[PDB]
């Protein structure tokens, strides 16, 4: 049965894992409350995209790519069309590059809204978990207007540019959204910086130094959260 | 082995009337009238759970079943009776079945206390605001046999965590009743609502015990509600807590019996601190949360049913305030749960008992 | 059908009904949230067809067969220690000389 | 229900707890049998107080303090079971007879 | 404690009248009015539960005037 | 006066179980953390305190002032029992 | 203190009271939902 | 109402001794700790029949609600102790204790039936929660204050006896001849 | 009416400050908190002297009596904890456990015991007996990592919580054999017929009375605890917890059983002729020093029970004078057991050899407090046996005095065996201290109260039989207050 011993207890987080960031399995071992080791078991969603790609042409593989970072979507299509277009030296026009910056920045917001919703419910208050869905559903329809489906499988990026131009009432509809969303960004900051029960869960909890972030190899808002100032849109 | 013949000696001697008087179930009409009002007290609290929680999220709630979700507590409770409840493979059998029974038969037997309505009182016992806190302490045992007999590691961890939570919040709940048992000069729940029936609203105990209502309110919701509860294992301290291996009709006791516990908590906030079956002047205007006339046939049928059910109507307000607190406070961790019922709610429940005195 | 990994992918089950019996299918990649609520409606139409006298066919049957083998049992490769494994504390000899 | 039947039941629980005190090998079932003795005492103490001197009940006030001592004896007692379990890896009364020649 | 004098008017008659109100103005109701709408479901719930499958809140067929 | 005929029937329906009960007699760590004991240990000390205060508080205005200083010596000496458990980390978890 | 403990409860129970004012004002808003089989949202 | 009170006595008096034979004779110690609450709930149900509504509620609150919970938290802390269970340990002295208990029970039943009890026909307990708290401050005042000192000391010692010494675990503070920490200076020695 | 319990309520305030300072000061309290409990115990002794002149009122609604017999035994238990604190100030500080938490458990056992002597109700007897018993189990398992101390507190709990349930069933019967009547004088007025119910309620209460005084069918906890327990607790359980069990025996078997008196004098005769045999012949085959003083305490509880079965005004006086001089013999011998157990480990006999040149103050103190335990003249334990035998021959009892004398000379052999291996063993025959004794300092922590507790008990052993004319007057006043 289930005995009661004195050695440290290993709990399996399980590949089930009812959370929105996929199927992870951690064999974290406990010391009453403190953890002493943890191994992440990954590869529950290893479908083999590096082996498919060796049997796909680029227009066959552009539908495949927006499934790695399926929170983001067109961030995967960004690199994929960039890899033969910066190798063949194919010029992208300035309008197609400006729509790519428009599409990637709306994807970064939708990537961040998909991170924030679970994270706020993980750290406490789960009433904003249902109101950041609605904020992402506006970006879902800016992608459904211009591109196809919803947030992924949106074949927008091409080698010579972008798949099609924007729709008619589109630029006036970010300006309805991106001017409505920006008041709500500061609402999310004053959710955690105020109410200082949340700051005692997030100060010093998972602290990684600057010197160990470059050594372990990090990027984006986890590297830059250690005071590294390394952004590849600027670098 | 002299007691082997003993338990079958008075068995058949009692069985001659235990089958003969078995058909006459709820032969008093005010016992059957209570159990219907007991059932629809819970069936509101499942409908009011899914509808208030949808209103704070700007979704609808259950439509498409009943008129507007009125049958959604019923189908959620009837599917669990129809599901083929199969035990886990390597587990206990007798301790697994009585797991949910020890949790919820306390909150069913101690429903006999609450005197909802001036003309619906089942029994005025010599106590009952003390018999309620005594019976509700059997519930940590059922969280230990639900955790033990389910025979997985994560529900023992959830069973020891659910029991040590109910341990922590029963002792400030005991002193919050001790404040209104000191003011009322007794434990009789008819005598408690009689001290508040003198001036209607200005003689309620929440006006006299502003802290002790708050000690009762945080301690009640830390033993029935969903807000300070780690049975959702969003912190992944367990798999799903002690209610993990429970499916079908045994989970229905864990599911619907946590709404009996919510209503019974709310039925005693509206007895102790708010006047049970107490309300202001009936012949009021159209803006009195009523119709438009002064003597309607719909208003002679209200106060006849409000005369039998007013404490539960008041308990329907604190059921509503318990859901409105779910989407307000953060889902606090267990290290700060037990640092509240011991380090905060236990001194301020003891200070209030001395301030209910002269000191 | 394991849709776009159904062509050449070395570890993908080609369709979930190679594992579990399924009631409703739902094409899309991804489906809209409206499209899955139609598959709930197609599912809700399928619950209503289920007669109450066919509750006995919902249980699995055990055509149990047994056989003995001579395969060597392997120790479990995934043990719970990651950081305090005896290879992370220091680089071993015959490696640090070239460092 | 007469007075004699309450005391026979109380003397029977006192008999059962004595069998649980000497025959049981687990060190916690010995404590569990002590609580059978202290509840055997309380059944006399309320059985007497209901039938003898029911106006000024004293055996019900005396039965309160028995419950509070047995709560304090069990709480202290299980800390002794937890102290012998921290050093000796068992709770088995046959392996605590260390003081034998 | 009567059979249906002061009970049949509560279980059968007045819940069909709240259902005339609940079907009409629930989504189009106000913010002060919807607090009274939740109370009417909450008070008359043993009657609203009985005459529940005998009323449907499904919207009417659309006109399709094109 | 109807709960006692009800309360008879809760036990009278379980007499069939008492006949069958007398015939019946005739890699999984849970780490030992002593906080499951220590949280119920301090509960046993204070559930026993609070049951002494129920006979005091019911008959509170019927006892006097010297019976109120007497109940303070009960209570103020288990305030010391509570602040012992804080400083000694008994209820820390 | 005995006065510091009963006055450490008002600083939170008021802040809870102006938390319930916000959540009740979330119920003032119309439910911005899509009832599916009777209001199907138009594809792009 | 006499026949319903009479056969609910033996419905509870059989429920307590079957649960008492359950806590003593069962091989599973965990099943004994849950049946121990079946002992205590029946006796707390037996006080309602004996006009002891306060001590009935004081038994559910303490014995079932606190002491039985404290047993179960300690039962499930010692479950990995011994799965060996040599029930025939060294001899059959487990039946040598079956005649001393039945000898006590034959002694007490010889006393109980033949002793003339002074049954008083006084109408009892007019709301016996005020007659039980007037005794806490007039008659039994000095037991009531000393029971407070009992609960303090039972909290001082049991916190001391059951805490894990994480303040300074390798601290043999001094030495004349060496004494281990948290162990008595009389060291074990074989002559 | 709360002036009669001033010796005990001075100690409850002293109990709280030595606990609160452990929380506030936090182990810097241990440098000052034992001396506060000494003047708290000295202030509790000093308030028994103005209570001596009062004419023995019965306070607290009849539940407490403040006679001279209550005051004598209150002073014995308060002097028992006074010498225990003088011993344990270094013994439990060297263990690493907290000193202030020890003296909270030690002073709760005192006011449990100080309230047993004056108790008069069945409810207050059992509560004060539980306060002495529960605090005793925590004290014997106070070191808590030894597997001897843990097995000591285990075996003492399971007989202690058992015998206090035997004692309760007898106390519950005394409530039932009378019509209510938790008062012990009101019990004696109601029951006098000596039925079989009164005999079962008598054997049950002296099954728990004689658990504390440890007569040999109930002594079985004593030798197993006394070598596992911390040695100051052994010095308290043998003196304080035995005098409280003897104060219980007078206030229970004379106030509540004056009709049934020839029965318990017949049982305590069996309890004494078996204590003097089995205490003083099983001590004869012993190697450990605390276990030799364990069967010693069982045998010299049988000497105190000589004065208890004769039932005369000099019988209970010899019972009480021997209990007073037994205090300054087991607070003297256990002091030198501790004072030797700090300078070396393994406090057992044959490791004591080769002394009197290294630790002469320990050797003179241990010899004169073991020689008087045998009853050699002109020490205090000799005069305690003489008055127990003078009162023995005064009313029958010619076989108890002869068994009291024949077992006192078996008692001389195992007490002189320790003086054999301290003064007669040559300096080439010592096992420990063979150039190993730490050259005793009297300047470290705790050893200065341990010396003033050594010196004051030997002075109260050399001179407390010579100068025992006031002590025979102080005791014979207390026996007027027995029925």
Residues of B in contact with F22 (CB under 8 A): 3-4, 6-8
Nearest chain D residue (CA) to F39: D75
Residue H140 near chain I (CB below 8 Å): yes
Distance from C-alpha of B207 to C-alpha of B216, rounded to nearest angstrom: 14
Residue H79 near chain A (CB below 8 Å): yes
Q: Which of I174, I162, I165, I308 lies closest to I249 in space, CA to CA?
A: I308
Residues of F in contact with D79 (CB under 8 A): 37, 41
Contact B133, B306 (CB under 8 A): no
Residue G40 near chain C (CB below 8 Å): yes
On the CB side of E5, CA atoms within 13 Å amount to 3
* Contact check, Cβ <8 Å, B40/E46: yes
On the CB side of H7, CA atoms within 13 Å amount to 23
> H-helix or E-strand containing A188?
helix A171-192
- Please write down the long-range contacts of H167-170, taking CB distance under 8 Å and 24 or more positions apart: H168/I96
Mutate to test the interface with F, among B182, B184, B351 (most CBs of F within 10 A): B182
Residue A186 near chain H (CB below 8 Å): no
Residue C10 near chain A (CB below 8 Å): yes
Mutate to test the interface with G, among B54, B56, B352, B354 (most CBs of G within 10 A): B56
Contact D61, I119 (CB under 8 A): no
For residue A133 the two structure tokens come to 């869905």
DSSP string, F5-74: HHHHHHHHTSHHHHHHHHHHH--------TTHHHHHHHHHHHHHHHHHHHHHHHTSTTT-SHHHHHHHHH
Closest CB to A124 among B90, B151, B330: B330
A residues 93-132 lying closer than 8 A (beta carbon) to B: 121-127, 130-131
Q: Which of F34, F17, F13, F37 lies closest to F25 in space, CA to CA?
A: F17
Q: Identify the CATH assignment for D1-101 out of 3.40.50.1950, 3.40.190.10, 1.10.287.3510, 3.90.870.10.
A: 1.10.287.3510
Residues of B in contact with F36 (CB under 8 A): 160, 163-164
Query: Phi and psi for B312 in degrees, rounded to 5?
Result: -70, -35
* Contact check, Cβ <8 Å, B51/E38: yes
Distance from C-alpha of I97 to C-alpha of H183, rounded to nearest angstrom: 9
SS3 C34: helix
For residue A127 the two structure tokens come to 């009433």
Q: Which residues contact H51 (CB under 8 A, 6 or more apart)?
A: D50, D54, H124, H125, H128
F residues 63-92 lying closer than 8 A (beta carbon) to D: none
Contact I214, I242 (CB under 8 A): yes
Residue H32 near chain B (CB below 8 Å): no
Q: Which residues contact B300 (CB under 8 A, 6 or more apart)?
A: none
Measured in angstroms, the CA of H88 and the nearest CA of chain F are apart by 19
> H-helix or E-strand containing A192?
helix A171-192
Cis peptide before I378 (omega within 30 of 0): yes
Tally of domains in chain E: 1
Contact E14, E44 (CB under 8 A): yes
CATH of the domain at H111: 1.20.120.1200
Domain range for E21 is 1-66
**Would H74 be classed as within a structural domain?**
yes
Q: Chains D vs C: touching, with 3+ CB pairs under 8 Å?
A: no
Distance from C-alpha of B73 to C-alpha of B255, rounded to nearest angstrom: 11
Contact B254, B103 (CB under 8 A): yes
SS3 G37: coil
Query: Phi and psi for A38 in degrees, rounded to 5?
Result: -160, 125
Q: Would you call B239 exposed, middle or buried from its count of C-beta atoms within 10 A (0-12, 13-18, 19+)?
A: buried
Residue B171 near chain G (CB below 8 Å): no
Note the Cα G11 to chain centre separation in Å.
Answer: 19
Residues of B in contact with G31 (CB under 8 A): 54-55, 58-60
Measured in angstroms, the CA of G33 and the nearest CA of chain A are apart by 10
**Would H73 be classed as within a structural domain?**
yes
Resolution (angstroms) equals: 3.1
Tally of domains in chain H: 1
For residue B97 the two structure tokens come to 């079945």
Residue B301 near chain F (CB below 8 Å): no
| C75 known member of a binding site | no
Q: Chains G vs A: touching, with 3+ CB pairs under 8 Å?
A: yes
Residue F76 near chain I (CB below 8 Å): no
Mutate to test the interface with H, among F37, F55, F63, F68 (most CBs of H within 10 A): F55
Domain range for H139 is 1-162
A residues 199-218 lying closer than 8 A (beta carbon) to C: none
Residue E58 near chain G (CB below 8 Å): yes
* Contact check, Cβ <8 Å, A31/F30: no
A70-92: b (≥16 Cβ within 10 Å) or e: bbbbbbbbbebbeeebeeeeeeb
Contact B270, B317 (CB under 8 A): yes
Closest CB to H17 among D6, D7, D12: D12
> H-helix or E-strand containing A41?
strand A34-41
DSSP string, C44-60: HHHHTT--GGGSGGGS-
Note the Cα H182 to chain centre separation in Å.
Answer: 29
Residue-range domains of chain F with CATH? 2-87 (1.20.58.1610)
Residue B95 near chain H (CB below 8 Å): yes
Query: Phi and psi for A150 in degrees, rounded to 5?
Result: -140, -65
Q: Chains G vs D: touching, with 3+ CB pairs under 8 Å?
A: no
Closest CB to H8 among F11, F49, F58: F11
E58 DSSP assignment: P
Rg from Cα positions in chain F? 22
Residues of B in contact with A130 (CB under 8 A): 57-59
* Contact check, Cβ <8 Å, A2/H79: yes
Measured in angstroms, the CA of F88 and the nearest CA of chain B are apart by 13
Residues of I in contact with D44 (CB under 8 A): 169, 172-173, 175-176
Give chain A's contact residues with G (Cβ, < 8 Å): 127, 134, 141, 144-145
For residue H43 the two structure tokens come to 């006796």
* Contact check, Cβ <8 Å, H107/I200: yes
Nearest chain I residue (CA) to D48: I176
* Contact check, Cβ <8 Å, I341/H156: no
| Torsion region of A216: left, alpha or beta (phi above 0 gives left; psi -120 to 50 gives alpha) | alpha
Residues of I in contact with D38 (CB under 8 A): 165, 168
Distance from C-alpha of H182 to C-alpha of H173, rounded to nearest angstrom: 11
Q: Which of D48, D75, D78, D74 lies closest to D61 in space, CA to CA?
A: D48
SS3 I454: helix
* Subunits adjacent to chain C (3 or more Cβ pairs under 8 Å): A, B, G
Residue C12 near chain A (CB below 8 Å): yes
Domain range for I157 is 1-483
Distance from C-alpha of I198 to C-alpha of I201, rounded to nearest angstrom: 5
Nearest chain F residue (CA) to D66: F48
Contact I2, I59 (CB under 8 A): yes
Size of interface A-B (CB pairs under 8 A): 44
Contact E30, B45 (CB under 8 A): no
Mutate to test the interface with A, among C27, C32, C82, C85 (most CBs of A within 10 A): C82
* Contact check, Cβ <8 Å, H134/F63: yes
Residues of A in contact with H79 (CB under 8 A): 1-4
For residue A91 the two structure tokens come to 């010029």
Question: How many CB atoms neighbour CB A198 within 10 A?
Answer: 17
């Amino acid at each position: 049965k289930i005995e009661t011993r004195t050695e440290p207890m290993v709990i399996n987080m399980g590949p089930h894992h009812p959370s929105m960031h996929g199927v992870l399995r951690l064999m974290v071992t406990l010391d009453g409350e403190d953890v002493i080791d943890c191994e992440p078991v990954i590869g529950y969603l290893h479908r083999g995209m590096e082996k498919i790609a060796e049997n796909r042409t680029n227009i066959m593989f552009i539908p495949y790519v927006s499934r790695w970072d399926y929170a983001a979507g067109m961030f995967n299509e960004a690199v994929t069309v960039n890899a033969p277009e910066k190798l063949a030296g194919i010029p992208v026009p300035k309008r197609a590059s400006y729509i790519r910056v428009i599409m990637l920045e709306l994807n970064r917001i939708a990537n961040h809204l998909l991170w924030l919703g679970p994270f706020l419910a993980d750290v406490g208050a789960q009433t904003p978990f249902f109101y950041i869905f609605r904020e992402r559903e506006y970006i879902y329809d800016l992608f459904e207007a211009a591109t196809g489906m919803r947030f992924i499988n949106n074949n927008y990026f091409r080698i010579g540019g972008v798949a099609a131009d924007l729709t008619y009432g589109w630029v006036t509809k970010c300006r309805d959204f991106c001017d409505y969303f920006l008041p709500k960004v500061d609402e999310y900051e004053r959710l955690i910086t105020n109410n200082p029960i949340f700051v005692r869960r997030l100060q010093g909890v998972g602290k990684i130094s600057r010197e160990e972030a470059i050594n372990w190899g990090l990027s984006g808002p986890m590297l830059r959260a250690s005071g590294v100032k390394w952004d590849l849109r600027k670098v | 082995x002299x007691x082997x013949x003993x338990x079958x000696x008075x068995x058949x001697x009692x069985x001659x009337x235990x089958x003969x008087x078995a058909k006459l179930l709820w032969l008093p009409l005010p016992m059957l009238m209570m159990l219907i009002v007991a059932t629809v007290g819970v069936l509101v609290a499942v409908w009011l759970e899914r509808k208030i929680s949808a209103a704070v999220q700007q979704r609808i709630g259950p439509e498409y079943i009943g008129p507007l979700g009125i049958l959604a507590p019923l189908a959620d409770g009837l599917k669990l009776i129809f599901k083929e409840d199969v035990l886990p493979a390597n587990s206990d059998r007798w301790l697994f079945t009585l797991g949910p029974a020890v949790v919820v038969i306390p909150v069913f037997l101690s429903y006999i206390i609450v005197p909802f309505g001036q003309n619906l009182l089942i029994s005025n016992l010599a106590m009952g605001v003390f018999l309620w806190i005594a019976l509700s302490s059997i519930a940590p045992i059922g969280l230990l046999m639900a955790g033990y007999a389910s025979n997985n590691k994560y529900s023992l961890l959830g069973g020891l965590r659910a029991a040590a939570q109910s341990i922590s919040y029963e002792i400030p709940l005991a002193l919050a009743v001790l404040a209104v048992a000191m003011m009322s000069n007794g434990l009789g729940t008819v005598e408690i609502v009689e001290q508040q029936s003198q001036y209607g609203i200005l003689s309620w105990n929440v006006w006299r015990q502003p802290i002790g209502f708050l000690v009762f309110w945080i301690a009640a919701l830390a033993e029935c509600e969903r807000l300070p509860f780690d049975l959702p294992e969003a912190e992944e301290e367990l798999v799903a807590g002690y209610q993990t291996e429970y499916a079908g009709m045994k989970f229905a006791l864990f599911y619907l019996g946590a709404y009996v516990n919510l209503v019974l908590s709310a039925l005693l906030v509206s007895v102790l601190y708010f006047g049970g079956w107490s309300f202001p002047i009936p012949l009021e205007t159209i803006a009195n949360l009523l119709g438009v006339s002064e003597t309607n046939p719909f208003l002679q049928i209200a106060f006849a049913v409000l005369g039998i059910t007013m404490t539960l109507i008041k308990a329907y307000f604190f059921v509503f305030l318990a859901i409105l607190l779910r989407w307000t406070v953060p889902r606090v961790r267990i290290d700060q749960l037990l640092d509240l019922g011991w380090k905060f709610l236990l001194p301020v429940g003891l200070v209030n008992l001395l301030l209910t005195a002269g000191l | 059908t394991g849709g776009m990994f159904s062509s050449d992918s070395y570890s993908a089950v080609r369709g979930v009904d190679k594992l579990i019996p399924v009631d409703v299918y739902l094409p899309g990649c991804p489906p809209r949230p409206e499209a899955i609520m139609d598959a709930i409606v197609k599912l809700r139409k399928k619950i209503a067809n289920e007669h109450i006298n066919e509750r006995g066919n919902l249980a699995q049957t055990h055509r149990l067969f047994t056989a003995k083998h001579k395969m060597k049992p392997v120790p479990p490769i995934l043990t719970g220690q990651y950081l305090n494994a005896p290879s992370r504390q220091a680089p071993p000899p015959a490696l640090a000389a070239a460092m | 229900m007469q007075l004699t039947y309450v005391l026979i039941l109380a003397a029977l629980l006192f008999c059962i707890g004595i069998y649980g005190l000497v025959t049981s090998r687990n060190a916690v079932r010995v404590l569990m049998s002590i609580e059978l003795l202290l509840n055997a005492v309380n059944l006399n103490l309320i059985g007497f107080a209901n039938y003898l001197d029911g106006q000024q009940i004293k055996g019900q006030v005396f039965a309160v303090f028995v419950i509070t001592v047995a709560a304090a004896e069990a709480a202290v007692g299980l800390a002794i079971i937890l102290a012998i379990y921290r050093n000796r890896d068992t709770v088995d009364m046959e392996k605590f007879n260390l003081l034998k020649w | 404690g009567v059979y249906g004098a002061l009970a049949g008017l509560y279980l059968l008659v007045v819940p069909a009248i709240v259902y005339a109100y609940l079907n009409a103005r629930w989504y189009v109701a106000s913010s002060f009015e919807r607090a009274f709408m939740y109370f009417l479901v909450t008070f008359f719930f043993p009657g609203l539960l009985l005459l529940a499958p005998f009323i449907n809140f499904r919207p009417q067929p659309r006109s399709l005037n094109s | 006066g109807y709960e006692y005929f009800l309360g008879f029937l809760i036990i009278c329906s379980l007499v069939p179980v008492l006949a069958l009960a007398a015939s019946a007699l005739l890699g999984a760590w849970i780490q030992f953390n002593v906080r499951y004991y220590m949280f119920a240990l301090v509960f046993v000390i204070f559930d026993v305190e609070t049951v002494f205060l129920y006979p005091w508080a019911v008959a509170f205005h019927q006892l006097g002032l010297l019976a109120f200083i007497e109940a303070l010596i009960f209570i103020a000496i288990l305030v010391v029992a509570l602040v012992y458990a804080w400083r000694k980390r008994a209820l820390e978890w | 203190q005995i006065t510091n403990y009963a006055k450490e409860a008002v600083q939170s129970a008021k802040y809870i009271g102006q938390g319930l004012s916000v959540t009740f004002d979330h119920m003032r808003r119309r439910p911005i939902t899509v009832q599916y089989p009777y209001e199907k949202l138009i594809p792009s | 109402a006499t026949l319903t009170q009479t056969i609910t006595f033996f419905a509870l008096a059989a429920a307590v001794i079957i649960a008492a034979l359950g806590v003593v004779l069962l091989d599973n110690v965990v099943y004994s700790a849950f049946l121990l609450g079946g002992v205590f709930l029946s006796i707390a149900g037996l006080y309602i029949l004996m006009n002891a509504d306060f001590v009935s509620a004081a038994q559910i609150l303490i014995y079932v609600g606190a002491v039985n919970v404290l047993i179960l938290f300690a039962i499930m802390l010692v479950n990995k102790r011994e799965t060996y269970t040599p029930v025939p340990g060294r001899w059959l002295r487990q039946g040598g204790a079956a005649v001393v208990s039945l000898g006590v029970f034959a002694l007490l039943t010889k006393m109980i039936l033949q002793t003339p009890w002074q049954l008083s026909s006084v109408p009892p307990t007019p709301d016996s929660i005020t007659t039980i708290g007037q005794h806490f401050f007039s008659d039994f005042l000095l037991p009531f204050e000393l029971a407070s000192v009992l609960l303090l000391m039972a909290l001082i010692g049991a916190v001391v006896l059951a805490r894990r010494e994480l303040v300074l675990e390798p601290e043999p503070i001094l030495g004349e001849e060496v004494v281990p920490p948290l162990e008595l200076p009389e060291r074990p020695r074989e002559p | 009416n709360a002036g009669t319990i001033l010796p005990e309520t001075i100690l409850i305030v002293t109990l709280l400050v030595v606990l609160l300072a452990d929380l506030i000061q936090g182990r810097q309290a241990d440098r000052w908190t034992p001396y506060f409990a000494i003047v708290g115990l000295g202030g509790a002794i000093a308030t028994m002297i103005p209570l001596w002149t009062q004419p023995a009122t019965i306070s607290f609604f009849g539940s407490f009596i403040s006679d001279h017999l209550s005051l004598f035994f209150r002073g014995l238990i308060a002097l028992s904890a006074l010498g225990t604190i003088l011993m344990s100030i270094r013994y439990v500080e060297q263990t690493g456990s907290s000193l202030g938490e020890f003296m909270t458990i030690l002073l709760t056992a005192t006011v449990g015991g100080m309230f047993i002597a004056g108790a008069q109700e069945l409810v207050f007897i059992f509560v004060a007996l539980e306060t002495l018993s529960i605090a005793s189990y925590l004290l014997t398992g106070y070191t808590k990592r030894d597997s001897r101390s843990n097995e000591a507190a285990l075996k003492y709990l399971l007989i202690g919580a058992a015998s206090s349930a035997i004692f309760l069933y007898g106390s519950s019967l005394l409530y039932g054999l009378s019509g209510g009547h938790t008062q012990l004088p009101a019990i004696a007025q109601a029951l006098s017929s000596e039925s079989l119910g009164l005999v079962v309620a008598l054997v049950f209460v002296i099954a728990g009375i004689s658990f504390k005084i440890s007569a040999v069918p109930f002594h079985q906890w004593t030798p197993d605890v006394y070598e596992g327990a911390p040695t100051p607790v052994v010095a308290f359980l043998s003196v304080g917890s035995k005098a409280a069990g003897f104060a219980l025996a007078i206030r229970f078997l004379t106030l509540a059983f004056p009709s049934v008196t020839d029965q318990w004098q017949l049982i305590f005769t069996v309890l004494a002729i078996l204590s003097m045999i089995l205490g003083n012949v099983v001590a004869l085959a012993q190697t450990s020093m605390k276990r030799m003083l364990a069967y010693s305490s069982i045998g010299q509880a049988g000497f105190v029970m000589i004065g208890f079965v004769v039932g005369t005004e000099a019988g209970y006086a010899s019972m009480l004078f021997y209990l007073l001089v037994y205090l300054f013999m087991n607070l003297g011998a256990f002091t030198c057991v501790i004072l030797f157990s700090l300078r070396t480990g393994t406090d057992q006999i044959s490791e004591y050899a080769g002394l009197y040149q290294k630790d002469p103050l320990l050797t003179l103190g241990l010899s004169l407090c073991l020689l008087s335990l045998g009853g050699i003249p002109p020490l205090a334990g000799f005069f305690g046996k003489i008055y127990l035998f003078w009162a023995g021959w005064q009313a029958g009892a010619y076989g108890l005095v002869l068994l009291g004398l024949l077992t006192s000379v078996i008692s001389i052999y195992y007490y002189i065996r320790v003086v054999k291996m301290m003064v007669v063993k040559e300096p080439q025959e010592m096992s420990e201290a063979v150039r190993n004794y730490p050259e005793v300092s009297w300047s470290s922590f705790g050893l200065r109260p341990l010396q003033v507790g050594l010196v004051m008990t030997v002075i109260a052993t050399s001179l407390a039989g010579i100068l025992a004319n006031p002590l025979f007057n102080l005791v014979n006043t207390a026996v007027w207050d027995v029925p």
